[PDB]
């Protein structure tokens, strides 16, 4: 298929490019640039082994969309264009709405005028909030999330959900996932977080690399087994993967597909580090600091449903998830090329 | 002070315009006409006793926001431009985003830019969803709304209130409130729809003017006095009044001041059936029909905050509303002219 990959040169969307080329699609990237860096297209190329249409511009430019819609006659699109760092979210909530919220609607917007009914949204499980039972299932009603982010993220979910309402021949997936880790196995492709990384396995990673001092580890007192946080990572290649499935089985199948993308059960803080001190072979420096502040105990995705729906579940380990990390820091410490 | 009134032209607006005036501020309207027309202008003029500035564009053209703003020299901001028909809502949802959601986020995003902190959101009480406990009461928590429209508003009220987190001088008050209605005194303006209208009120008075043959009750079986649905009407001179002491009270006053803008009283359909038939010297026409789509038995607001607060409170009757909505009706037929 023809599909139209927003936001496909930054972490998780080229690893998704690779594998959509990988399994023939014609691939059409749509990034602004302002999280990631041309020098990874031929890096998607070459691991694609295929040419990936590139072109630099805004989701929010509601008409250059719906031209590039026409230009390349597209069947899908997966939309991964938006901001995601949540304390950010806190201090710039505008700037998030704006990209997230006004930039899916008028992406879906250019759509609906040039008649595109396909659509995976890269959703996020922040919308469940704090709407638990855990691990949350898809049949959980949504909660209220914390940030601005985690509301974009729910707004967006509910507007697609409406739309697919008023316009029933819409196929379109809510692809809920939590934390996206790892790369290529190529070390060619990874996460390149240009300020202070937002996410553990990188923080971590800049520690282990000299980059940093020590993790912080917020809270050593939870009701868990090792009393630090116990979260959800999930390879980006698993995650990638997730993706394509769920484009070319969804594609041209009527409703709001909603799927949590995860492994199916959570890690402490001290076991990832423990995997990354293994991985890059010495000790990774930390000290405990008390509760942060949006940070619950534990929470994990219920992948069920993926797996009975999709025949979707995660391959990789932790451990590959530490390594993958530690490979491509290592070949490339100075991540993506200006 | 200088206020600018997006969707001034529109029903509540325009009532607040008057009094805007009357109390003698610098009012600049901004509307699209989308709902409105010039024709009202001389009237909100000549009720007003002083001149309003027009201003022809859209809340979502930010630029043009902007250029108002400075032109202007604004102090504050009182928001009613939108759309609010709910059915509409979800039959074209996107439309309802992007003008109520979009539509504000452009407008705030452009008083930032020209340094305008003060804002009154001109809110719903559709947002307390289903998280009653009734009436409802600020210290609330919001619920989920059934309609884009519904959805839309609080969406908006999110935002608002973390763009006040974030920009802390501030001043923003959401005023929610439910059924607007009634005319001004004179007779010489009012609500009106052009189509079929949304509002009970309106329905009755076309059905009392001949152009419909009988009103609909949907459910006379509700577990409520007389068994139809209780709701809270407002008369429109009291909820402009509202928008006023709220505008002059809170402005530099920095925070996020909700309030709910009602009677603090709810009555059924009868009840207002009735107010009606007395209002227009005859019995209007009506028969019951099975309960509605997304309707509650009752429900209406708690309005001691305003009261305690801003020392407001609705001074006008149902039977008021009645009449004066006869009054404008009967005056004005036709409407306003083309
Ligand atoms: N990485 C995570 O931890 C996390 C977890 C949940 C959800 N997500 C979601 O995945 C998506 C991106 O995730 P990511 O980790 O690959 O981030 P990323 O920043 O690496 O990728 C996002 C890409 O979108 C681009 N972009 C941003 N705003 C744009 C706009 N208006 N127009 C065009 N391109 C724009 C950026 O330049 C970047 O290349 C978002 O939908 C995000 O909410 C990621
Ligand atoms: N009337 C009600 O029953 C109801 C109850 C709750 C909330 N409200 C709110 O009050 C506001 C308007 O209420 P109303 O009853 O006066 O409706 P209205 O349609 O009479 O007034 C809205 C005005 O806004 C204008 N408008 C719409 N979209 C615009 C845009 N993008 N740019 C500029 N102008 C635009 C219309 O032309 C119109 O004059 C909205 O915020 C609505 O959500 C009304
Ligand atoms: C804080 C944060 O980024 N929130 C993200 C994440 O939360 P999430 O908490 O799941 O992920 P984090 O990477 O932020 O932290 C994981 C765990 O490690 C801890 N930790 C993390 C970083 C660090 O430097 N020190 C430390 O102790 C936290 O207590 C937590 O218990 O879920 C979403 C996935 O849909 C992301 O899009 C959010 O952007
Ligand atoms: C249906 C509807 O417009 N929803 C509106 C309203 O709901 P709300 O239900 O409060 O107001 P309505 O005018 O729609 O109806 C009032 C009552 O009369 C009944 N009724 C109404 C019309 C009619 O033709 N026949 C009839 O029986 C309904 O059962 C209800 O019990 O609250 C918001 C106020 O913040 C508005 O912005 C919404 O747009
Ligand atoms: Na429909
Ligand atoms: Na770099
Ligand atoms: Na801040
Ligand atoms: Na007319």
Redesign the pocket.
């Known amino acids: 298929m023809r599909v139209l990959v927003?936001?496909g040169?930054?972490?998780?969307?080229s690893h998704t490019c690779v594998q959509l080329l990988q399994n023939g699609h014609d691939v059409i990237i749509?990034?602004?640039?302002?999280?990631?860096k041309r020098s990874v297209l031929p890096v998607i190329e070459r691991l694609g082994g295929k040419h990936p249409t590139f072109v630099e511009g805004?989701?929010?430019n509601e008409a250059l969309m719906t031209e590039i819609l026409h230009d390349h006659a597209i069947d899908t699109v997966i939309h991964?264009?938006?901001?995601?760092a949540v304390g950010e979210s806190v201090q710039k909530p505008l700037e998030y709405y704006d990209?997230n919220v006004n930039?899916t609607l008028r992406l879906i917007s250019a759509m609906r005028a040039a008649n595109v009914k396909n659509f995976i949204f890269?959703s996020?499980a922040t919308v469940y909030g704090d709407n638990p039972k855990i691990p949350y299932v898809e049949s959980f009603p949504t909660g209220t999330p914390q940030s601005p982010y985690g509301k974009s993220?729910l707004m967006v979910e509910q507007i697609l959900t409406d739309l697919q309402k008023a316009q029933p021949d819409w196929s379109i997936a809510l692809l809920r996932?939590?934390?996206?880790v790892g790369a290529h196995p190529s070390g060619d492709m990874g996460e390149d977080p240009q300020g202070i990384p937002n996410?553990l396995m990188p923080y971590i990673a800049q520690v282990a690399v000299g980059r940093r001092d020590s993790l912080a580890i917020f809270g050593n007192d939870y009701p868990t087994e090792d009393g630090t946080g116990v979260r959800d990572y999930i390879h980006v290649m698993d995650l990638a993967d997730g993706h394509v499935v769920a484009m070319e089985k969804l594609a041209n199948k009527p409703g709001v597909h909603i799927y949590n993308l995860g492994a199916g059960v959570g890690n402490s803080v001290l076991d990832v580090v423990n995997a990354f001190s293994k991985a890059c072979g010495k000790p990774v420096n930390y000290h405990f600091a008390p509760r942060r502040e949006g940070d619950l105990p534990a929470y994990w995705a219920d992948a069920s449903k993926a797996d009975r729906e999709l025949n979707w579940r995660v391959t990789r380990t932790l451990d590959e998830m530490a390594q993958d990390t530690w490979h491509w820091q290592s070949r490339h410490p100075q991540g993506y090329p200006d």
């Open positions: 927003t936001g040169s930054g972490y998780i969307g749509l990034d602004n640039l302002c999280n990631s805004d989701i929010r991964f264009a938006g901001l995601k990209n930039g890269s996020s993220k996932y939590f934390n996206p996410n």
